[PDB]
């Protein structure tokens, strides 16, 4: 009972949601630029900055609701589209449904929209993580730097183009557009003085990875003069060319993943970036790198053994997990947890397009939400106690009971409790790896789920418990409704996403 | 342990006594019982028990375990 | 026990107290972060109910 209306419903919703976000951004930018001469905040109640914040937060939220509706439309459309090809067994008739373009708005960048489940999962992560990050950046945007309230809308538009185009060049460009806003956020919004060098490190590392990916895509474009994945399907690369391409894409997207030994930039940036960007950096952009690697490697036939890449990913996991005990800084500890989770997810994409990308996508979403929650907790601790080191703050549970409870439940969720989606992703990846390599699977599970977990819990349990004896005059208050609701939404997603349709997982 | 003063602003549970705890107990027990009754009905829809005393499973009945016909 | 002081006569047997959150009950700001997050929660719940529950 799947008719033509739902197809156009999904396509129209995707295109017009992109245009909704773009029109909101354009109107907000026009108002911001043409209402003031200097375009800095006027320090009074009657300021455009209030309207800018309202417009951006509401654009993000309403476009997220529209994206939920369009994601459900896409799920139904994709299920029934795969069904229609599978359904008919008669050899005389084939599924030939040719669609028309909409009349009101043009195809942006003259490209037909192609939607995949991984792309829309990435877009949903973009929406939610950007919402949380912008909610975590209101205290940082002030006089002369309010212009970065539009940064997350720019990210949403870039990724919306990124996950909906079948053009390989537009794909690469949208992957490449995520650097300038990120560097601008780290350079101008970060309060720490050490964040300038962190921004430089982030730029240079991610741009070396981008150069490697650029070499790979240049090979792809120059050899087979096209920009379509189907045209790639109609072409074969020799063994040497395929080896060079896979090495280049893996190394670049692992510079962005990050992977061992290319996570120094991530550690420095996470320690020094503002908490909102740290939520957005760990939660989302690395997932864009994963999506790029998945799109690049799946479309190319590779005949080499992936044991080297698997070893690199597992070494990254082990290296990140063994360093969690020696971290007295909660934000750096969360950064190492992000490194571990990212390397685990990147491991799942080392078997091509087998039934291993499902665990990769689920773990990408789970790590997005977990990293957002953990960096948000670090933000709350740093805003309350004005410190992040374990030697300066402890006994949070007794002065700020809600923050301590949130920390404890974050640890429970991070320990892979079966009710949540981290356990599902671990089950997928570890079952596949155990059937692939049992001893390496046991090594990965031992180092990650015991040693790394022990260190991670040690650095958080010591902060949660104790006595906040010093500075009783300066002790903060409990959690506000915004932080409480953000934490509860992270918990709610990590719990209820286990009940998502298993067709795509 | 000797009682010590607790800050008024702190939402902690140290030596907390609610004078109206009886109605709170009523209105936290009975709706919980109703919710658990509904969940119990839902789970009793999907419930399996072995045959009672004196009852055997006919191997040719549809209830008996089945094997795949390739 | 030997010398027990009942709840009424106890000077340190607290009744329920404390502020639930850090939000000022008498806050005069048109702050909308709480409303936005409540809207996000409710719309997500409705989308699950109205699109995915059955």
């Amino acid at each position: 009972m799947f008719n033509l209306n739902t197809i156009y419903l999904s396509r129209i919703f995707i295109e017009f949601n992109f245009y909704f976000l773009f029109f909101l951004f354009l109107i907000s930018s026009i108002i911001f630029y043409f209402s003031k001469i200097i375009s800095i905040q006027n320090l009074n109640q009657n300021s455009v900055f209030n309207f800018l914040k309202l417009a951006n937060i509401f654009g993000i939220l309403i476009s997220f609701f529209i994206h939920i509706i369009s994601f459900w439309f896409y799920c139904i459309y994709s299920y029934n589209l795969s069904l229609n090809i599978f359904s008919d067994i008669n050899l005389y008739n084939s599924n030939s449904i040719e669609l028309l373009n909409n009349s009101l708005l043009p195809n942006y960048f003259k490209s037909n929209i192609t939607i995949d489940f991984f792309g829309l999962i990435l877009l949903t992560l973009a929406y939610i993580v950007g919402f949380v990050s912008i909610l975590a950046l209101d205290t940082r945007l002030y006089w002369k730097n309010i212009k970065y309230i539009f940064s997350f809308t720019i990210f949403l538009l870039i990724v919306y183009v990124y996950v909906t185009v079948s053009n390989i060049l537009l794909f690469f460009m949208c992957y490449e557009l995520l650097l300038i806003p990120s560097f601008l956020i780290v350079y101008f919004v970060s309060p720490s003085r050490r964040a300038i060098q962190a921004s430089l490190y982030f730029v240079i590392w991610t741009q070396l990875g981008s150069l490697l990916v650029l070499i790979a895509i240049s090979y792809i474009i120059s050899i087979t003069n096209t920009y379509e994945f189907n045209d790639l399907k109609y072409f074969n690369f020799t063994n040497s060319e395929s080896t060079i391409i896979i090495f280049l894409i893996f190394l670049g997207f692992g510079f962005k993943a990050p992977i061992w030994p290319f996570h120094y930039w991530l550690t420095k940036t996470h320690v020094e970036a503002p908490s909102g960007f740290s939520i957005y950096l760990s939660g989302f952009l690395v997932k864009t790198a994963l999506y790029g690697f998945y799109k690049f490697n799946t479309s190319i036939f590779i005949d080499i053994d992936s044991s080297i890449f698997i070893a690199i990913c597992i070494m990254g996991v082990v290296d990140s997990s063994l360093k969690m005990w020696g971290q007295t800084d909660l934000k750096k500890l969360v950064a190492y947890g992000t490194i571990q989770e990212m390397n685990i997810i990147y491991l799942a994409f080392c078997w091509g397009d087998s039934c291993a990308i499902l665990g990769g996508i689920l773990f990408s979403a789970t790590h997005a939400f977990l990293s957002a929650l953990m960096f948000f907790l670090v933000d709350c601790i740093y805003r309350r106690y004005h410190t992040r080191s374990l030697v300066e703050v402890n006994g949070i549970l007794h002065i700020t009971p809600n923050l301590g409870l949130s920390i404890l439940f974050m640890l429970v969720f991070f320990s892979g409790i079966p009710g949540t989606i981290k356990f599902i992703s671990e089950f997928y990846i570890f079952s596949g790896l155990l059937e692939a390599s049992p001893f390496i699977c046991f090594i990965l599970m031992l180092v990650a789920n015991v040693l790394g977990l022990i260190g991670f819990s040690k650095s958080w349990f010591n902060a949660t418990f104790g006595m906040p004896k010093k500075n009783t005059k300066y002790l903060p208050m409990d959690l506000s409704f915004k932080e409480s609701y953000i934490i509860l939404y992270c918990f709610f997603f990590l719990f209820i996403f286990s009940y998502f349709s298993s067709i795509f997982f | 342990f000797q009682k010590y003063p607790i800050p008024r602003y702190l939402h902690v549970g140290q030596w907390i006594v609610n004078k109206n705890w009886k109605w709170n107990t009523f209105h936290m027990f009975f709706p919980t019982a109703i919710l658990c009754f509904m969940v119990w009905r839902n789970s009793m829809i999907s419930t399996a028990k072995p045959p009672n005393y004196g009852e055997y499973v006919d191997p040719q009945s549809p209830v008996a375990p089945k094997a795949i016909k390739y | 026990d030997a010398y027990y002081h009942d709840d009424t006569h106890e000077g340190l047997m607290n009744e329920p107290h404390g502020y639930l959150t850090m939000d000022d009950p008498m806050d005069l700001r048109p702050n909308y972060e709480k409303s936005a997050l409540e809207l996000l929660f409710l719309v997500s719940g409705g989308a699950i109910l109205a699109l995915m529950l059955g």
Binding site: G326, Q327, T328, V391, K469, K470 | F1, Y4, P5 | -
Partner: peptide, 27 residues
């Protein structure tokens, strides 16, 4: 009983004063 005891002293939770460098090798 038999004496009006003051409230529990703040000495019940003595403030620890760091007299030594917290070495990073003892992290």
């Amino acid at each position: 009983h038999g004496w009006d005891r003051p409230d529990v002293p703040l000495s019940f939770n003595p403030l620890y004063v760091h007299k030594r460098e917290l070495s990073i090798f003892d992290t």
